[PDB]
């Protein structure tokens, strides 16, 4: 059983796609926060695949307990594949979560949803260019028009932890990359090897939840803290700002193409 997880911002159309894929009639509403818990189902056209509908999430640093459900599912390493549902009308903001999903080490396939609205707004995105610069497969989809749904399930099924070798993580400012490497060595075996980069960046971000979940040694805590301090002076900017800016700068470079 291949495990595919529907991850994306709230109101991106995850349940709409789920319902089409599974034949289900799970709750779909035109406001953020309808889906509040996990729901599994089998892919109608390919019964070997199990797909998970999860609540909308703005980032892997959750604000509400509903956002925690999606995060915990991915970090528990249950999912073989991340089907990242992206709102094409709000691309830049949706990609902020995308950068974090890749970092989890679970291969990401993008469903570039609501392509119909984008067509009605008189705009077009070079799908192949976006896919190449992002390092992940991209299929333009519409849940309304029922466009590209089967194709994106197909690709997600072929982009799992079992079929993908080395992954293409988003590369940031080289000065931050040095800090990430050092934290990766400090971390050693305190985290899964697959998700190591995700945790390393979140520890640099001083994410309270990650810090508590990992329960790192006093020696590890001192060295990370030292790595952050030095990198802050190099960047002449606070740790949270460095990462936030570096994600959006990466997003900027990808979108212009
Ligand atoms: N126009 C258009 N609307 C969509 C599309 N996908 C979903 N929707 C609509 O987007 C809203 C959000 O749907 P939903 O599945 O609840 O989003 P979710 O919170 O990610 O599960 C609903 O009003 C759907 O009718 C799409 O591809 N095109
Ligand atoms: F905002 Al939702 F499922 F209702 F992501
Ligand atoms: K919704
Ligand atoms: Mg939903």
Numbering used by the authors: 1 to 257
From the paper:
The protein is separated into three domains: An N-terminal cytoplasmic GTPase domain (G-domain), a helical domain (together with the G-domain termed ‘NFeoB’), and a C-terminal polytopic membrane-spanning domain. While the import of Fe2+ by FeoB is dependent upon GTP hydrolysis by the G-domain, the mechanism of coupling between the two events is unknown. Like other small G-proteins, the G-domain of NFeoB undergoes significant structural rearrangement in response to nucleotide binding and hydrolysis. Recently, it was shown that the rate of nucleotide hydrolysis and conformational switching by NFeoB is accelerated in the presence of potassium ions, and the protein has been classified as a member of the potassium-activated TrmE-Era-EngA-YihA-Septin-like (TEES) superfamily of G-proteins.
Crystals were obtained in space group P212121 with two molecules in the asymmetric unit, and the crystals diffracted to a resolution of 2.5 Å. The transition-state structure shows the canonical G-protein domain fold (residues 1–170) interacting with the helical domain (residues 171–270). Conversion of the GTP substrate to its transition-state causes Switch II, and the adjacent portion of the helical domain, to shift away from the nucleotide binding site. Switch I, however, remains locked its active conformation, capping the nucleotide in the same orientation observed in the mGMPPNP-bound structure. The potassium ion lies at the nucleotide binding site between the G1 P-loop and the apex of Switch I. The ligands for the potassium ion are the backbone carbonyls of Gly29 and Trp31, the sidechain amide oxygen of Asn11, one oxygen each from the β- and γ-phosphates, and one fluorine atom from the transition state analogue. The bond lengths about the potassium are long, up to 3.2 Å, which is necessitated by the strict geometric constraints imposed by the protein and the nucleotide ligands. In this way, a binding site is created which is selective for potassium rather than sodium – a smaller ion that prefers significantly shorter metal-oxygen bond lengths. In its magnesium-bound conformation, the backbone carbonyl of Thr35 hydrogen-bonds with the attacking water molecule, which is also the recipient of another hydrogen bond from the backbone amide from Gly56 from the G3 motif.
